[PDB]
Amino acid sequence: GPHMATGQDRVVALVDMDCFFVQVEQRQNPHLRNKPCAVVQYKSWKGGGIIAVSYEARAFGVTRSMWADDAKKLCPDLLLAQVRESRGKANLTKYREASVEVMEIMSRFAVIERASIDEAYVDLTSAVQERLQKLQGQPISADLLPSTYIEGLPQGPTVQKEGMRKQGLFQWLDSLQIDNLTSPDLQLTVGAVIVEEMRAAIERETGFQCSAGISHNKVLAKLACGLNKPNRQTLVSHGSVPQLFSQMPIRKIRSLGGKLGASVIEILGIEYMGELTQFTESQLQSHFGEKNGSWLYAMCRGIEHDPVKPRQLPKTIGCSKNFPGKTALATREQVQWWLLQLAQELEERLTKDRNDNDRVATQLVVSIRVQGDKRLSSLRRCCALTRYDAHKMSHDAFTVIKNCNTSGIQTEWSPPLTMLFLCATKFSAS
DNA sequence: ATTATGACGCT
DNA sequence: AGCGTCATG
Ligand SMILES: [Mg+2]
């Protein structure tokens, strides 16, 4: 009762740039704007692999991880932009730089955690307190929430999308208690006002549109973000959780989309996240371990404690290339040439990182895949990264991997390599 | 031949 | 340290 925590102490948002690489290309090339468009890596094999898809193209069934030739079967007018190639490989610098533009804007409003190139969590708790003090008990107008959906509303006693959105928002705001500065629902609503302002600033200052979720923790904010895309935001209140979870497949919750989620489904014989409430914490820990069991117990009630980490920069800087099928590397000269290409891109990115961010990486991770290995990485080995020099880095990587060549001939490499990966890690301030 | 990343957990 | 999982609706 009065002692049961409800996990309503924070306001957290998740901001996701809509089809981010597509938007970067559409800003650069106006002919791609408001068209079915996708971004592809490479071209020779089946037209290249699609990695980002505009919402107009998604309407035709185009998706990521589809070959461009196949996408063109679904969408003959699909427009394509290709990722830049440098040193024989895809080079994502344009998108990393555009991501920095967006993250720097977001950081003006609140502390952000860079979850990925196109996604950031935002801790809004303090900003909401400040805005509530500035809002001396003044109600929140629907005009301050022009792109906000309130999940679960309208309910109870028009046939157009925007009309439905406004009906739900009106029900929410009429129900609000704008007098109580500690009301979690009011706090979320102010959070949504701030996120509208942040999203407007991003669009004005970059041209990029985003969707967002606002809730009391990261998992619910992420789930909320997915409910209304593109270019919209969704508020998931604590009270909305029972209904929302009652038909929510377990795999939709962040971290449960893989083997653990499949095991929850199979072991417990359930389908939906709300069904988890019927198990005790000890029962869940007995199946899924102490940590996962406690997390599931709280998360199915809408409660999660994982903090928004104050981290706007990536923790690693990596360069990776697959060599699939016939392109696998089979000679020593070939392996060394590609290690050098990767290391030259890595050196360029590291030197820029050091100038921009006042830090230096101290560990080099080298990973390879060998032909016929079911795992993504056949081997990972670390060595010291003491100098930002591509030739030294590629020589050191060759040194750490050279004992995997089972070929008795040092000129040949066997079995051929299907992946090379260099990653700089363990940054220290400088 | 579902890339090229990048997060975090386990032991 | 090296390996595995999860994510990119
Ligand atoms: Mg996105």
Side-chain angles (χ1 to χ4, degrees), chain A residues 71-91:
Chain A
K72 275 290 197 178
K73 304 170 183 167
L74 298 177
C75 183
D77 303 315
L78 181 67
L79 301 179
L80 298 175
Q82 39 193 138
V83 172
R84 172 184 164 220
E85 163 278 309
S86 298
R87 303 171 196 92
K89 61 177 302 292
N91 186 298

Side-chain angles (χ1 to χ4, degrees), chain A residues 16-19 118:
Chain A
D16 207 299
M17 283 101 94
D18 295 326
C19 50
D118 46 17

Side-chain angles (χ1 to χ4, degrees), chain A residues 53-237:
Chain A
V53 186
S54 80
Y55 280 76
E56 292 80 356
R58 296 182 189 200
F60 288 85
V62 183
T63 68
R64 73 176 273 277
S65 307
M66 149 206 300
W67 297 116
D69 284 355
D70 294 335
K72 275 290 197 178
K73 304 170 183 167
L74 298 177
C75 183
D77 303 315
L78 181 67
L79 301 179
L80 298 175
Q82 39 193 138
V83 172
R84 172 184 164 220
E85 163 278 309
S86 298
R87 303 171 196 92
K89 61 177 302 292
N91 186 298
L92 309 173
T93 301
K94 191 197 303 185
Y95 315 105
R96 290 192 184 95
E97 293 180 349
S99 178
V100 170
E101 282 181 73
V102 173
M103 309 249 163
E104 298 196 320
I105 294 163
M106 282 189 296
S107 295
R108 301 205 311 259
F109 292 77
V111 152
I112 78 167
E113 174 181 344
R114 181 200 199 266
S116 86
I117 195 162
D118 46 17
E119 316 193 38
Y121 294 94
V122 191
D123 201 318
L124 292 167
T125 309
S126 301
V128 159
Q129 228 48 54
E130 288 181 3
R131 185 64 168 277
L132 272 171
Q133 286 153 26
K134 287 29 220 151
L135 282 167
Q136 319 248 168
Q138 168 172 356
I140 311 189
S141 159
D143 293 341
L144 302 185
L145 295 161
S147 63
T148 294
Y149 279 81
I150 309 296
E151 172 61 24
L153 298 180
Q155 77 173 1
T158 183
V159 300
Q160 192 182 2
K161 197 159 217 333
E162 174 65 9
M164 290 294 288
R165 185 200 72 82
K166 287 200 117 314
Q167 291 171 225
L169 183 57
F170 287 149
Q171 293 191 349
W172 176 255
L173 293 177
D174 310 338
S175 290
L176 270 188
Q177 192 42 263
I178 39 83
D179 179 36
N180 181 11
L181 276 74
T182 61
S183 169
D185 289 343
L186 180 56
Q187 288 165 359
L188 289 185
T189 302
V190 173
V193 171
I194 294 170
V195 176
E196 291 274 12
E197 293 164 354
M198 185 188 286
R199 289 179 50 245
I202 293 167
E203 187 173 6
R204 179 193 82 90
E205 301 174 31
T206 71
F208 300 141
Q209 291 181 350
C210 296
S211 297
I214 305 97
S215 192
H216 288 296
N217 56 62
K218 288 162 78 176
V219 165
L220 288 182
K222 174 60 170 178
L223 185 64
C225 186
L227 295 178
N228 296 283
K229 287 195 176 186
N231 198 32
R232 293 294 184 267
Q233 56 183 62
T234 305
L235 185 160
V236 162
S237 66

Side-chain angles (χ1 to χ4, degrees), chain A residues 178-370:
Chain A
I178 39 83
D179 179 36
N180 181 11
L181 276 74
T182 61
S183 169
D185 289 343
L186 180 56
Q187 288 165 359
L188 289 185
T189 302
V190 173
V193 171
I194 294 170
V195 176
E196 291 274 12
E197 293 164 354
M198 185 188 286
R199 289 179 50 245
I202 293 167
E203 187 173 6
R204 179 193 82 90
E205 301 174 31
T206 71
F208 300 141
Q209 291 181 350
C210 296
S211 297
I214 305 97
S215 192
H216 288 296
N217 56 62
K218 288 162 78 176
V219 165
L220 288 182
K222 174 60 170 178
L223 185 64
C225 186
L227 295 178
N228 296 283
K229 287 195 176 186
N231 198 32
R232 293 294 184 267
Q233 56 183 62
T234 305
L235 185 160
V236 162
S237 66
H238 181 73
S240 77
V241 172
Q243 285 237 66
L244 180 58
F245 279 10
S246 72
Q247 300 189 267
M248 182 69 62
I250 283 160
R251 67 180 177 274
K252 303 301 186 175
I253 280 64
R254 195 205 73 219
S255 85
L256 301 180
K259 291 180 180 183
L260 174 62
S263 76
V264 170
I265 288 160
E266 175 164 310
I267 288 168
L268 297 181
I270 63 179
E271 280 164 44
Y272 302 123
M273 180 81 188
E275 295 180 82
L276 281 164
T277 64
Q278 290 313 291
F279 300 92
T280 69
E281 188 171 2
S282 302
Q283 278 177 313
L284 297 176
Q285 291 175 321
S286 83
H287 292 295
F288 311 111
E290 190 182 323
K291 190 174 172 243
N292 289 334
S294 285
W295 183 85
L296 290 163
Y297 183 85
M299 183 72 263
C300 71
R301 295 162 167 77
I303 300 168
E304 200 205 20
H305 293 306
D306 185 43
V308 176
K309 324 302 198 263
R311 182 188 56 79
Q312 159 175 27
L313 304 173
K315 296 169 90 132
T316 57
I317 294 183
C319 288
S320 173
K321 184 165 174 51
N322 289 350
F323 302 92
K326 194 171 162 65
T327 73
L329 312 182
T331 78
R332 180 177 64 188
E333 296 288 329
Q334 229 189 333
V335 173
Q336 295 178 343
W337 189 81
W338 282 108
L339 284 171
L340 180 59
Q341 302 322 292
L342 285 184
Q344 284 179 351
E345 181 190 326
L346 188 53
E347 184 191 320
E348 174 178 57
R349 287 164 60 192
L350 282 173
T351 299
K352 173 70 150 262
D353 185 70
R354 189 186 62 219
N355 283 334
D356 293 342
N357 299 319
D358 298 313
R359 61 186 189 165
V360 311
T362 69
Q363 198 174 243
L364 182 73
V365 188
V366 185
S367 181
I368 59 183
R369 182 152 79 251
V370 178

